[PDB]
Amino acid sequence: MISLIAALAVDRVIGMENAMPWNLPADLAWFKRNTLNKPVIMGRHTWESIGRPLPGRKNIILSSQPGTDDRVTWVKSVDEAIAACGDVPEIMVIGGGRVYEQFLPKAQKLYLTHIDAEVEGDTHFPDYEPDDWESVFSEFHDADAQNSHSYCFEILERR
Numbered sequence: 001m002i003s004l005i006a007a008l009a010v011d012r013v014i015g016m017e018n019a020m021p022w023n024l025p026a027d028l029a030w031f032k033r034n035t036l037n038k039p040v041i042m043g044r045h046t047w048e049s050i051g052r053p054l055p056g057r058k059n060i061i062l063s064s065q066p067g068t069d070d071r072v073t074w075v076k077s078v079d080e081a082i083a084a085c086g087d088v089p090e091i092m093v094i095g096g097g098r099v100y101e102q103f104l105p106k107a108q109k110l111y112l113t114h115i116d117a118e119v120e121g122d123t124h125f126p127d128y129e130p131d132d133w134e135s136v137f138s139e140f141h142d143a144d145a146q147n148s149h150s151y152c153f154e155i156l157e158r159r
Ligand SMILES: NC(=O)c1ccc[n+]([C@@H]2O[C@H](COP(=O)([O-])OP(=O)(O)OC[C@H]3O[C@@H](n4cnc5c(N)ncnc54)[C@H](OP(=O)(O)O)[C@@H]3O)[C@@H](O)[C@H]2O)c1
Pocket: 005, 006, 007, 008, 013, 014, 015, 016, 017, 018, 019, 020, 042, 043, 044, 045, 046, 047, 049, 062, 063, 064, 065, 075, 076, 077, 078, 094, 095, 096, 097, 098, 099, 100, 102, 123
């Protein structure tokens, strides 16, 4: 199955200047828990934003140009990215905006974090059709001394 995972601020903002404009330790822990031991597909700008390979995961980077780092796998099309994952139960697509748009029609599950933060951004999660999706899990958390915003973890499944 293909799944997307993302953290969204207000108005579906996901990034600004090739970075994320918040620091939510609890959300990165959720990201790690839901991606470890799975392949992760990302676009080249997200690869540069993370800045290093993610441990315990097969890292697959989409770019139209040849690769520049043999610690990760480089592919040149969506279909090649999927194939490079081979025969696993669940493929995690970890962004960014352009990559999420291309994989959304192919996805069966969304792992969304809704963050109560107002930030200017330059990248948005796609504007998906809510009627297509069933919420199967939601868990709200208030802000605390480690996490400066409230946030809600949600899992949706395609109906
Ligand atoms: N909040 C979140 O959960 C989250 C998650 C991930 C990323 N982000 C943010 O998202 C932003 C980056 O997103 P973005 O939309 O600018 O970029 P992106 O989707 O990460 O990367 C786009 C690049 O991927 C390559 N690519 C995409 N589709 C391709 C295809 N079909 N075939 C070949 N190459 C393909 C191209 O690289 P080439 O130009 O080399 O061809 C393209 O320029 C950053 O701000 C980052 O912090 C946020």
